[PDB]
Design a protein around this ligand. Sequence first.
Ligand SMILES: [Ca+2]
Ligand SMILES: [Ca+2]
Lengths: 164, 164
Amino acid sequence: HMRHIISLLMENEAGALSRVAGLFSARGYNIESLSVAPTEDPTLSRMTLVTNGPDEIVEQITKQLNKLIEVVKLIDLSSEGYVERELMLVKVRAVGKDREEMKRLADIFRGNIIDVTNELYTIELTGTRSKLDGFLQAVDCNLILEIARTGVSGLSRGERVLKL
Amino acid sequence: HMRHIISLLMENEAGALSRVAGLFSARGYNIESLSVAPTEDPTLSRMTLVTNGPDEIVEQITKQLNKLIEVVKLIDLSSEGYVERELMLVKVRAVGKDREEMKRLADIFRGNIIDVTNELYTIELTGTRSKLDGFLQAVDCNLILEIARTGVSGLSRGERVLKL
Ligand SMILES: [Ca+2]
Ligand SMILES: [Ca+2]
């Protein structure tokens, strides 16, 4: 039951994504998080999807995904060197001494405050999964007003590219 | 008309995604970018989605969308003050004088190199849509080896929050 980061190229067209999400849904496959946006080439979008399972489940999801005509290339990004980043926006209640505390946490995690009132901050964070998770462990939950978190975006290390 | 950024707070069921994605697909409308990931509410995910069509029509989907039990709340983020950021990973061919040149761009856009060889950089860039777009506008496209870009993560400004 471990994390695989699936990376795929697909037809930037209507239904493309609803069909990819439908394939998971039909069979109750987990989607932890999902990023998709156009590439260099506007006919093709790049999707980064994170799923949680034993290998034999992932290999079957991977088998089924390749079968879709709108899925063009596909790699388990996790099976080779890669880099990943996520972006997160955390809106936090920040009054009295918690104003200093929230500012210290932002600086420690190298985030930036991008919205501010007398009683709140919106903090922008970028990093690996664990950095962003470490931020959330470190903040008191009762302070969090809401969170918007982009889901992982990754690339293979070095010369390896998905389109080739 | 135009560009719309829709935030939804929903169940993390696969395709609850597909079902949301479907209602844009249903009308023949392309989802340009999309992000969905866990929130503090372990059972709930936040999804931002950027799309293109006429206000009344989006408002059609809006309604259709609200009536899904899987959807807790939604707003059209543009209808009120908001902050938005995307993240992007851009792998570039960086040989000779382009090494100095590609590093300068990174610096000017305030991005970070997170993968480097003799012949390439992968640059991480975080910002508004127009900033990332402007970075892409600045690089000769024969230098871009691949891009993985997340699409928006957005929140209302100030005390406005979606779960409320
Ligand atoms: Ca295929
Ligand atoms: Ca509802």
